[PDB]
Amino acid sequence: MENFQKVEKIGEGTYGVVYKARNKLTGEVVALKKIRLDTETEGVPSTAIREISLLKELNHPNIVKLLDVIHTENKLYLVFEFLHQDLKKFMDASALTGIPLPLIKSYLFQLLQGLAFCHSHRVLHRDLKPQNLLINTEGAIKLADFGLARAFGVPVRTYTHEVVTLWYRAPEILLGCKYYSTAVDIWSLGCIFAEMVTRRALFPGDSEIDQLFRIFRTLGTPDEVVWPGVTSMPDYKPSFPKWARQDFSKVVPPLDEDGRSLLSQMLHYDPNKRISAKAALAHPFFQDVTKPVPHLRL
Amino acid sequence: PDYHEDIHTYLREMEVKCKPKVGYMKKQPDITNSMRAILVDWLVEVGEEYKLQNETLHLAVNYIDRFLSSMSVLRGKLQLVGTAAMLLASKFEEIYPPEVAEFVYITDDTYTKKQVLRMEHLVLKVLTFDLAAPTVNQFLTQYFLHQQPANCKVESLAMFLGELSLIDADPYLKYLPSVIAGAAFHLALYTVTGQSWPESLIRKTGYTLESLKPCLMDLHQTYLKAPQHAQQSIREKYKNSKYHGVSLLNPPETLNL
Numbered sequence A: 001m002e003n004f005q006k007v008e009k010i011g012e013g014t015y016g017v018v019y020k021a022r023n024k025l026t027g028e029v030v031a032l033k034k035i036r037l038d039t040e041t042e043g044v045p046s047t048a049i050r051e052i053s054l055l056k057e058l059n060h061p062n063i064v065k066l067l068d069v070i071h072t073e074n075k076l077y078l079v080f081e082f083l084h085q086d087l088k089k090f091m092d093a094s095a096l097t098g099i100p101l102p103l104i105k106s107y108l109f110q111l112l113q114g115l116a117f118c119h120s121h122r123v124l125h126r127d128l129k130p131q132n133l134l135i136n137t138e139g140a141i142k143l144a145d146f147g148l149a150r151a152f153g154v155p156v157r158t159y160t161h162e163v164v165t166l167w168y169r170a171p172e173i174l175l176g177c178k179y180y181s182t183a184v185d186i187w188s189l190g191c192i193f194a195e196m197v198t199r200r201a202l203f204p205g206d207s208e209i210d211q212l213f214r215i216f217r218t219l220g221t222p223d224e225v226v227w228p229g230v231t232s233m234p235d236y237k238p239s240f241p242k243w244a245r246q247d248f249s250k251v252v253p254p255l256d257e258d259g260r261s262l263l264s265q266m267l268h269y270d271p272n273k274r275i276s277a278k279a280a281l282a283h284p285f286f287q288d289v290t291k292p293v294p295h296l297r298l
Numbered sequence B: 001p002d003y004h005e006d007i008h009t010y011l012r013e014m015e016v017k018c019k020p021k022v023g024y025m026k027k028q029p030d031i032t033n034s035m036r037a038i039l040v041d042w043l044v045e046v047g048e049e050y051k052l053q054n055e056t057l058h059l060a061v062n063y064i065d066r067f068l069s070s071m072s073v074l075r076g077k078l079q080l081v082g083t084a085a086m087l088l089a090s091k092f093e094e095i096y097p098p099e100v101a102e103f104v105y106i107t108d109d110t111y112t113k114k115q116v117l118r119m120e121h122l123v124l125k126v127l128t129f130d131l132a133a134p135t136v137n138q139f140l141t142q143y144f145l146h147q148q149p150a151n152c153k154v155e156s157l158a159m160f161l162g163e164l165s166l167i168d169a170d171p172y173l174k175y176l177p178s179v180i181a182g183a184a185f186h187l188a189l190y191t192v193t194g195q196s197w198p199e200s201l202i203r204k205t206g207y208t209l210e211s212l213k214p215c216l217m218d219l220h221q222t223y224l225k226a227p228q229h230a231q232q233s234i235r236e237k238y239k240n241s242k243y244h245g246v247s248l249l250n251p252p253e254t255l256n257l
């Protein structure tokens, strides 16, 4: 730890504090996740254990690289590669102009490529959101924060205190399914894809019921035909208003036939029918995919 | 499904990397397979008292064998190695794990909170944080999807035989998790229905009933001698209705292989 110079605080959380640092010997610019253990009366947090195990197994250009783990009696530090900004800051700068479709296409292709690797290596992210997605000046996007990530060698049971912020939560979680699946991660990206296009959160709910209703108002209220077993879900209510599906020309107006097709499959109600990362990567949407460089304001 | 074939291929790849040294207990001067068998059986009780998942139990045993493959431990500290591993397995697999104070309580104050926390750190250092280990449990569930309609008595029974194999390092350390999970399912299926290792599972794993025969012979002997074994916490756990009282089922006299 003596070889690192802290430069700037680049994010906080319960997980630990993330800083921008410089290796004084090699000059290598890293991101450091500080995890205070003298504070932690229960030892090494399950998130730090889950994030280190899983990330150090996940070597992919669309997954953040974990360079080191400096484990001491006093604190725990995770050393990672550095990336210039998160998709949230990029999205806010582009709220006036707009992210051009070739860059949306590049970004979703890469997110799907990282996610496909996660999933083929039995790992759920469970917290995909713009700020957890990091971009660089050379044109790449990578998945970050594997704090709530889990190995699904045996099915992952649902937990209330360890779920994604409402806005990117899947309808199954909200209706109380007993288990997670790869489909939660796909829904999250679908929300993020529509956000890149329309320049705003697709389902910006203030509560679990407000979250559902915003989903139901857009994709229509699901029924036993659309989603078999939905009326048997713990948090389901027959009293729910029965809205009709809005046309994707109104939902995502600047999106083409393929883009509208891929998103409709990414936002399928039934997790068994929802498109996989592997499948989406074969979608005609990505036939003409290129790697453009973004316009960064550092 | 898209990634299901890939996961099995990856776990098969990982189960070799996460395998402990087979004859590690030989280069271990103060501890033996009996101490290990007593320790693994005790963690079975711990799991039941705290309602932990059977994967949590499977991960702890892997961590233990791996720690003991690279670290010399005296009998006095063997239970501390086991407590820190169960705590680490619980932190990795449980929605929320039992607190450290509870782990110190189930050792009847044999160790301190500081000791448990220091051993956790040591286990993590020794295992280099590689805690996502493939287990018999993991390969059994991937195999169960090749049984439609499913027989929950076969599932419970394979779970039981799979668990028995955690107690006896000799001979189960010489078999990989996928091979025990194969033998357990064949022996479970054959005992309940009379059916054998399916062709869909032969194609999936690339394992013929002949390749499973050395493990299956041992898993069959363990099943026959199970009421006679010194360790009985697994037989008690599975005579419950939760696992359809499978431990109360009489094993077959012969397998006919």
Ligand SMILES: NS(=O)(=O)c1ccc(N/N=C2\C(=O)Nc3ccc(C(=O)O)cc32)cc1
Pocket (backbone or CB within 6 Å): A010, A011, A018, A030, A031, A033, A064, A080, A081, A082, A083, A084, A085, A086, A087, A088, A089, A090, A134, A144, A145, A146
């Ligand atoms: N706020 S901003 O200017 O848009 C911004 C945000 C984030 C960053 N970098 N973050 C990280 C980076 O470089 N490597 C990382 C590895 C892991 C994590 C994590 O949370 O687990 C975060 C980062 C830069 C600018």
